[PDB]
Amino acid sequence: GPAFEFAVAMMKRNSSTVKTEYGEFTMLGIYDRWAVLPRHAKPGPTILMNDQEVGVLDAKELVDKDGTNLELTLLKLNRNEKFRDIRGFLAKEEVEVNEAVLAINTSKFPNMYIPVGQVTEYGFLNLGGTPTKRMLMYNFPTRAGQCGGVLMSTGKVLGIHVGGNGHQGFSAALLKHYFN
Numbered sequence: 001g002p003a004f005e006f007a008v009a010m011m012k013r014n015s016s017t018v019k020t021e022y023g024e025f026t027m028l029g030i031y032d033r034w035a036v037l038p039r040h041a042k043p044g045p046t047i048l049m050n051d052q053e054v055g056v057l058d059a060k061e062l063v064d065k066d067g068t069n070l071e072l073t074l075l076k077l078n079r080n081e082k083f084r085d086i087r088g089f090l091a092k093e094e095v096e097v098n099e100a101v102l103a104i105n106t107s108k109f110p111n112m113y114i115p116v117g118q119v120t121e122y123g124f125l126n127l128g129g130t131p132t133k134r135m136l137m138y139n140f141p142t143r144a145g146q147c148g149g150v151l152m153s154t155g156k157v158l159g160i161h162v163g164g165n166g167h168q169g170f171s172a173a174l175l176k177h178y179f180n
């Protein structure tokens with residue numbers, strides 16, 4: 001109930017639809033001109049954000065202290081408007097919750113919300129041939145076009161949807177320290 005209300009407002013204020021050469025994704029703006037996509041979106045020097053061409057000043061593919069994939073890319077966008085600052089909604093470590101909502105904002109899934117149920121710290125996953133850490137898992141059959149979806153509970157932005165095996169979905173935990 002509260003989590004859906006939270007999700008809808010978060011998506012209205014901070015999310016957008018992006019197209020790269022690799023597809024269409026939900027994008028979440030974090031603060032200032034820094035946003036996040038799934039790594040596999042592979043943003044080039046320009047992206048389409050709500051159909052408008054926007055320059056990418058800088059792009060950072062995140063890894064842990066061993067070089068292990070986190071499956072997030074951080075993007076600094078060449079634009080006047082600043083994102084509302086949502087770092088206070090990001091945890092310091094992986095959040096487990098009993099009820100979460102996954103929010104999608106593309107041309108395909110416009111303004112769609114999915115109650116995924118329980119979110120568990122899955123940790124390690126071999127994600128399409130790549131060893132990947134800090135995965136959050138939910139037992140909903142997510143499908144192609146949901147990448148970049150934003151995983152939320154009431155007052156919490158938990159992670160970004162980056163993959164699925166047809167039966168379970170996985171989110172990269174969105175941690176506060178990535179945005180210091």
Ligand SMILES: *[C@](O)(C(=O)NCc1ccccc1)[C@H](C[C@@H]1CCNC1=O)NC(=O)[C@H](Cc1ccccc1)NC(=O)/C=C/c1ccccc1
Binds near residue numbers: 024038040163
């Ligand atoms: C998203 O990337 C996605 O929704 N992409 C847009 C898209 C639209 C149309 C066609 C194809 C893609 C995708 C979400 C998955 C797909 C099935 N269910 C989901 O929730 N994610 C992937 O395709 C990722 C891509 C990837 C991740 C990391 C590095 C490089 C690429 N791959 C997987 O989820 C693979 C999973 C897997 C599981 C078991 C065994 C082998 C592979």
